[PDB]
Amino acid sequence: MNIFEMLRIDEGLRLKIYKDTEGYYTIGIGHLLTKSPSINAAKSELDKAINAAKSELDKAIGRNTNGVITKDEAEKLFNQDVDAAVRGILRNAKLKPVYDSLDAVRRAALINMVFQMGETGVAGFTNSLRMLQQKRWDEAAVNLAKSRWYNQTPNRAKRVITTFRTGTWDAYK
């Protein structure tokens, strides 16, 4: 198991533009496109958005696709995304250090968070981060759980948390 397989599981795979739990238009392996609008919107709106998401996609892939892509394409996007998450982490004054202190498995967990919630979002978990740095496994997990993230996506948060707590991939077995 590794980062790719890990997120592959947590994020799923889809070749058609769908929308995430947080009302975002996305595709492939969790590839964000555009903020979705509220249903209280009409054609003007909705279509405008579909439109926009669509453009984003085209732009990303470099071709006209009418909201649909291939596996190869997704996998490409995917890699790029993992890469990026891994750069935010290194570019971040708060993440870099936590990251460095962690074992390979746990590193993976951090990347996941980052990938799921952006470097900005993640750096926001100051207490949890510190705890991670002190290697206070269980405390962190408790801290981590007291979050929007957990409450919103519990199953996924669970796997991640456990991962941090055990330094193993059991949660993913």
Domains and CATH numbers, the chain: 1-173 (1.10.530.40)
Whole-Å CA distances, 36 to 26, 43, 97, 134: 9, 13, 35, 39
Can you give the resolution of this entry in Å? 2.5
Cβ–Cβ under 8 Å, residues 167 and 103: yes
Residue 110 counted as an annotated binding residue: no
Contacts of range 118-126, beta carbons closer than 8 Å, 24 or more positions apart: 118/88, 119/85, 119/88, 119/89, 119/91, 119/92, 119/95, 122/95, 123/92, 123/94, 123/95, 126/94
Cβ–Cβ under 8 Å, residues 112 and 3: yes
Cβ–Cβ under 8 Å, residues 95 and 123: yes
Among 117, 106, 101, 100, which Cα is nearest to 141's?
Answer: 106
Among 44, 43, 22, which Cα is nearest to 33's?
Answer: 22
Method used to determine the 3D structure:
X-ray
Residue 32 counted as an annotated binding residue: yes
Residues 6+ apart with CB under 8 A from 84: none
Q: What one-letter code names the amino acid at 20? A: D
List 31's β-bridge partners, or say none.
27
Residue 127 counted as an annotated binding residue: no
CA gap 138, 132 in Å, rounded: 9
Residue 128 counted as an annotated binding residue: yes
Instruction: Sort 31 into a burial class: Cβ within 10 Å, 0-12 / 13-18 / 19+.
Output: buried
Instruction: Supply the residues annotated as catalytic.
Output: 11, 20
Whole-Å CA distances, 47 to 38, 82, 97, 118: 12, 30, 44, 27
Structure tokens, 118: 């952006």
**Helices (H), ranges, the chain:** 3-11, 44-61, 71-91, 95-101, 104-123, 126-134, 137-145, 148-152, 154-166
Structure tokens, 102: 């962690």
List 28's β-bridge partners, or say none.
14
